[PDB]
Design a binder for this molecule. Structure first.
Ligand SMILES: Cc1cc2nc3c(=O)[nH]c(=O)nc-3n(C[C@H](O)[C@H](O)[C@H](O)COP(=O)(O)OP(=O)(O)OC[C@H]3O[C@@H](n4cnc5c(N)ncnc54)[C@H](O)[C@@H]3O)c2cc1C
Ligand SMILES: Cc1cc2nc3c(=O)[nH]c(=O)nc-3n(C[C@H](O)[C@H](O)[C@H](O)COP(=O)(O)OP(=O)(O)OC[C@H]3O[C@@H](n4cnc5c(N)ncnc54)[C@H](O)[C@@H]3O)c2cc1C
Ligand SMILES: C[C@@H](CC(=O)N[C@H](C)c1ccc2[nH]c(=O)[nH]c2c1)c1ccccc1F
Ligand SMILES: C[C@@H](CC(=O)N[C@H](C)c1ccc2[nH]c(=O)[nH]c2c1)c1ccccc1F
Lengths: 560, 539
């Protein structure tokens, strides 16, 4: 559960996830995941190749560092490395461009040195040395950023420290009276839940990156998790934090559950994306481990009816732990991942239709997956409430097995990038939040802008462009898109990708969607920020950065 | 529901509330509230006199200095204004005890020079521009209900002070029934907002005790909390969007997405800013269908600790009703005295929602409560407790007629500090009063008004007969400061909801850290480099 210092021992140096986990063709020519890490690991996916084929049309730099600083660093006993593999591993997150530069290229700039502090006091020492020797610090936790938040600016001439938090990973206390846990910021989501569970508790904060993403990362990026309906997003979960900045340590003097003591400075730090200082410790709300979990799924005649149903569920404030509504292409894709071998003489579509002979169109139908957790009595009553609401919108119970499957798929989908890259398929997921009344139109127009933009950029085939609704709020929804294409005969595939991704974002903003729901701004969405938060708002951000970090030690250049 | 420009037409110039609403002795010698405005109005309270006697042992203007080029430009805007003394004085204070004395039997060091009534966002922009041009100071005012000296004009402010009154900027702009949000002007009062929305079948459910007069703008500025936050949220959960006029320009996000990751949330730079950065002119707030049904309740416990433990369990099972308040023995006796064993405690309950869910919920709560020795004590108690909510503020003016002074104060604290904090704060008030010559042991009582996952809001009342003290305000001021020191020393916060204003400024830096304080200052100096927004709250 602890990230080791030499990460490549465990994790892939050139893509997502663990070294022991990749898609390969088995001895029957069926896609399958190696290893035994996930419940889908070692399970043949006999229809998956076909769905890939049908969908995409393919056949299956020296360490520049001051010796005085070095010398002082040795006295601290803080572990460090100037090794290229350590530096490179920490020079990127998980944006598509980054993964290409790992594979077929090299980064313009990487950290000069990697430090592993093990506690708050180590971080204070490091920041003090950075003030003294004019060093730039870029913090890293899990390295899961999808916003270019870890990329080293190419023209940064100072020595860049990668301040790796992975060895600051302790739970410091569990306060069972107040249901809070105070933890060091480098603890990963899986390690955090694992240790709390041994005492009968959890946070319930479950981003899809939880295997590697950290408490400090979550706070920095305003992370959102699958079960936020019950447990809250990161801003609802964090009760307290400690932050080391060049100006000194930020920390409130008490742990009162709610205050009126001026503008909440916790929100000056949350979303700061490594531009102000290092979050070293935080107190986070915990809950007793749920007695009981129940999966579920519901089919709707179309997406629009599914959206209307999600809205009503939000309106009655009876959303389960997790509810996600997927469009018909994702419904199909999920169909394509089950274990029963088709006949080769019956098509994909004709195979689906006979299988679900619902009075529904199988090219229109959408599916919501559901997760309920809590006390078994409560969960079961609540499941019946949601299913009764769904019945009113044409909804039909589609079984716990799809829900259970959908929920497992989430930790596996990231492993599909690298598979795609082996076979000329590139893509990325992206997200927005939008008012309830813009959701349908926004999804339709964005998927369409992407088709028009690919066609016009010489993309041979119509791209995969697909969506689901992943979160519901009172005032709207999170919409999560996937965009993918075969880059067969494009001169500059990345450019085409990059430009199409920007055009989708322009379309999103024009349809009432936000700049980001959860991934953040990093360096990827900087150019829209000022418009999103207004000029004065941007200058307020700037004024906090100039005060706390006047010499721009925290020089990742995100946000501003 | 609109506050008139001449507030004294309807509201007491020297105290809380409406002119038609005061406690008096009726024709049977029983206390009673005059007028028809509350459900308790014109209802005799046979044993309230008796309770008071037992408890406290009693029986029963500077000129307006204004630049004429400024006034000349101001006339051209057609924005209504006044330099009249009664308008300026009315807006020179809130509802702290010391201010109510300077209002009654003295005079304020400093009052606004001129009162402006903008009716919209654009008016406000014009005003702020004129303040930049003529070097004027602006103190915003909504309901004037601050209990933190947040409206007090600094004595040495030599610039012309504008009281920028938001009461005529009070309209609902639109109600989006698809997204359940209402976009409103910031001067609307809570009662007028709920009244209008209720005609369309909606509510916000944000019900601070001051809702008759407090405004949307005020709530955002002070981080207000309401009685039913368990269902609807506090102000930070309710506000989806806002528009703010600062000297640097207008702050406003470009979209109404329900939740974002776009850097530090700048809504939180303005929420809690207490009039020091600019004017909140408009806000979008979440609404809900009006609940079908309300039910009251009450539970008796053998003592306060047991009640507290039960509240904690209720919070732990995340099954709090709309409101749950636990009062100590003294407040139980008080409440008993206001119908039409020395340690026994009582919780009042308010459930609201759909009838069948409410009844189900109510059973669940009584069940939990039985495990801490909790016994159902009737719906009528609960009802009465909640109907007293809006009349307690009228009791100050009663007490002042009979040499009784006091104030309420509040904190939030972790669950494991609540009982010790209550006991220690209450004893520190006794100790301090005796040492300063207060003849009779003060009233010193508490209740838990809100529960959260990580703790509770604790609400105190302190009051005494000041018979034979020579500086009774100084005794009060010092005792309240002492109580605050005791709260902080027992793990309580500087404020749960009242805010800091000028009253708690001295503790702020310690509460939020030096660098934290420095972050607030840097925002102020950016948005407002010449301190046009110069009430001097917080910093
Ligand atoms: C497969 C996959 C699934 C994902 N699922 C989700 C999801 O469900 N929800 C979601 O919100 N996000 C998701 N993400 C995005 C990402 O995991 C989150 O934004 C996460 O919060 C980053 O955490 P981390 O520890 O990896 O931070 P990193 O990626 O290490 O760094 C993030 C930013 O924070 C800074 N930083 C990191 N730690 C600290 C610290 N202690 N102090 C100060 N600054 C710091 C870095 O400098 C950088 O700017 C996903 C990403 C991937 C690749
Ligand atoms: C009897 C009584 C009961 C109360 N009950 C509660 C309660 O339950 N919960 C609670 O939280 N508080 C309560 N309070 C305190 C008070 O009502 C709240 O702080 C309320 O939010 C203040 O609103 P207001 O419009 O009265 O603002 P005012 O008191 O007019 O102003 C408060 C501060 O905000 C500034 N301001 C006002 N409007 C604006 C604007 N539009 N833009 C920028 N700044 C502005 C003022 O300069 C001042 O600094 C109570 C007060 C009293 C007297
Ligand atoms: C799954 C996706 C690639 C991708 O978007 N990966 C990133 C790292 C990712 C994967 C899952 C995420 N969940 C979330 O909230 N943010 C997420 C970001 C993909 C793979 C293969 C082909 C196309 C494609 F879009
Ligand atoms: C009721 C109280 C006076 C008082 O504190 N009134 C203020 C204005 C008040 C009244 C009600 C409040 N509710 C809340 O959250 N904060 C509140 C503040 C009182 C009256 C008479 C004698 C003593 C005394 F403490």
């Amino acid at each position: 559960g602890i990230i080791p210092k030499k990460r490549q021992e465990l994790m892939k140096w050139n893509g997502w996830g663990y070294n022991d986990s990749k898609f390969f063709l088995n001895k029957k020519g069926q896609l399958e995941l190696t290893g035994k890490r996930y419940p889908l690991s070692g399970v043949a996916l006999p229809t998956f190749k076909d769905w890939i084929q049908n969908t995409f049309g393919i056949n299956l730099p020296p360490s520049i560092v001051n010796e005085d600083f070095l010398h002082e660093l040795k006295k601290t006993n803080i572990s460090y490395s100037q090794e290229a593999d350590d530096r490179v591993f920490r020079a990127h997150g998980h944006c598509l461009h980054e993964i290409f530069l790992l594979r077929e290229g090299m980064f313009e700039r990487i950290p000069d040195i990697v430090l592993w502090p093990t506690c708050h006091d180590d971080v204070v020492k490091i920041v003090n040395l950075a003030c003294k020797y004019n060093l730039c610090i870029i913090p890293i936790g899990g390295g899961t950023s999808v916003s270019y938040g870890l990329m080293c600016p190419a023209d940064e001439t100072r020595t860049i420290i990668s301040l790796d938090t992975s060895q600051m990973n302790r739970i410091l206390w569990v306060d069972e009276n107040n249901l809070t846990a105070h933890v060091e910021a480098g603890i990963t989501g899986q390690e955090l839940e694992r240790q709390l569970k041994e005492s009968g508790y959890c946070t319930g904060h479950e981003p899809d990156s939880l295997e590697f993403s950290t408490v400090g990362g979550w706070i920095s990026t305003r992370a959102s998790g699958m079960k936020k309906n019950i447990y809250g997003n990161i801003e609802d979960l964090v009760v307290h934090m400690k932050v080391v900045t060049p100006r000194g340590v930020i920390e409130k003097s008490c742990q009162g559950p709610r205050m009126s003591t001026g503008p909440d400075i916790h929100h000056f730090i949350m979303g700061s994306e490594g531009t102000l200082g290092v979050i070293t410790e935080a107190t986070i709300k915990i809950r007793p481990t749920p007695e009981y979990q129940k999966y579920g799924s519901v089919a709707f005649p179309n997406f629009e009816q599914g959206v209307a149903c999600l809205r009503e569920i939000a309106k009655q404030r009876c959303a389960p732990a997790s509810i996600r509504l997927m469009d018909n292409q994702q419904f199909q894709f999920g169909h394509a991942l089950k274990p029963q071998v088709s006949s080769i003489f019956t098509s994909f579509l004709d195979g689906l239709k006979k299988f679900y002979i619902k009075g529904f169109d199988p090219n229109q139908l959408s599916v919501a997956t559901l997760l309920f957790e809590g006390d078994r009595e409560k969960v079961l009553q609540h499941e019946k409430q949601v299913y009764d609401i769904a019945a009113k919108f044409g909804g039909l119970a589609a079984g716990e097995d799809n829900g259970q499957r959908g929920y497992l798929l989430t930790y596996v989908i990231a492993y599909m990038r690298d598979l795609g890259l082996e076979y000329y398929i590139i893509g990325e997921s992206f997200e927005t939040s939008a008012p309830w009344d813009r959701v349908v139109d926004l999804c339709r127009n964005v998927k369409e802008r992407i088709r028009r933009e690919c066609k016009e950029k010489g993309v041979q085939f119509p791209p995969l462009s697909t969506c689901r609704v992943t979160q519901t709020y009172d005032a709207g929804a999170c919409i999560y898109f996937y965009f993918a294409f075969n880059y067969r005969g494009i001169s500059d595939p990345l450019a085409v990708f990059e430009q199409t991704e920007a055009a989708a974002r322009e379309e999103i903003l024009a349809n009432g969607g936000s700049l980001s729901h959860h991934h953040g701004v990093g360096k990827l969405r900087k150019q829209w920020l000022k418009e999103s938060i207004s000029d004065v708002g941007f200058g307020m951000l700037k004024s906090v950065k100039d005060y706390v970090d006047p010499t721009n030690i925290f020089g990742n250049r995100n946000l501003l």
